[PDB]
Symmetry: D2
Subunit: 114 residues, 4 copies
């Protein structure tokens, strides 16, 4: 699994379950095109989010639907979305874990690359 | 000024000076219209980034060129860019401060919103 | 004002008012001596917490009562306290700002040094 | 194990390997008693840091030697140490995971409880 996520809820002290996300690829032209979607399970993770064949070198954007998550928790969020934009396999294939720490008016995006 | 930023560098323990950013406004069709650009000063701020009149209610996107910042600092960063997207309702002298804390492989974005 | 703080609330998107904190100075024998206490105003700051004369070089500890901050809002927090421990002026006098970003189960502590 | 840690390096984008830490239990007299030491493996973790027998309800301190970590990485750090203090099993017994995101001048401490 070349692309993994781990989302934590800083209000409740649990993983953030049922967070919807979208994975897009940047075109040669210059825009975005959506290639996969997923929803986190109760551990804040998504297994088999994409295949290694869907994940060639290039720039990708992962859009986390934090607004819906907080709304479904009964809280008022600030951000309309949380976007993580990165160049993948710039100099050699490897595995990516996007860690995301959520609060209604704040998030922290970190990356663990192996 | 209804929209301020504060950017800090978590490696050096200073504000992040000379960071370029773009402010865009979501249009009715769902695209984006650029409405301002700026570069942080040595305190990590941009004074008078936009006027009250340029900042009506709606969705905005603030795009911070952190890649260039880290490259110039001599570190190889993870993120191509940092984007903060939010719905503004700037009724009643309601001000937004976007705080951003930068690390080469991490950032934290928070907002402070007045009343 | 060599020692300043800026505390923010990541749940509601405001500065964290009425946060009590204590400043202690490490002693030769390894112990801690309290030198100042204070409470953040509504901007999340404390003015005139200590003087330059009270702030010689050495190890300090700033203890933030985050538990009461969350308890008094009716939320349930994780940490008993937030403690920021640092060596001050190890290469000369400076000015120190401790920024603190608070959520019930998380905080981020950063320093701005001049 | 009832107490796990996960330490990430936000400069390199990897787990923080070989971080030393100490676990202490607050005593009735307001002091601290050390109950364990440990050192993270290359995944930023410590397997079996303590046992259930060592973990009655009460306040605990986990002290992470982050200064030595950054010194070895060849960076100049701000904090002397990173300290996490929390009340364990306040409303009954729980399992705890402490997440720590490290930068030379910043850290984020988060908790995942049960
Ligand atoms: O298992 C985990 N992994 C990561 Cl990467 C984080 Cl940030 C937090 C936890 Cl609990
Ligand atoms: O004025 C400010 N200063 C600092 Cl240091 C932070 Cl983190 C946030 C704000 Cl709004």
């Amino acid at each position: 699994c070349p692309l993994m996520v781990k989302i934590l809820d800083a209000v409740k002290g649990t993983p953030a379950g049922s967070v919807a996300l979208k994975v897009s690829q940047k075109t040669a032209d210059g825009g975005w095109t959506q290639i996969a979607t997923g929803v986190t399970d109760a551990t804040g993770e998504i297994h088999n989010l994409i295949t290694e064949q869907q994940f060639p070198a290039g720039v990708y954007r992962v859009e986390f639907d934090t607004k819906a998550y907080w709304t479904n928790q009964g809280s008022t969020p600030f951000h309309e979305v949380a976007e993580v934009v990165f160049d993948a396999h710039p100099e050699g294939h490897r595995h990516y874990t996007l860690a995301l720490l959520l609060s209604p008016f704040s998030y922290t995006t970190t990356a663990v690359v192996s």
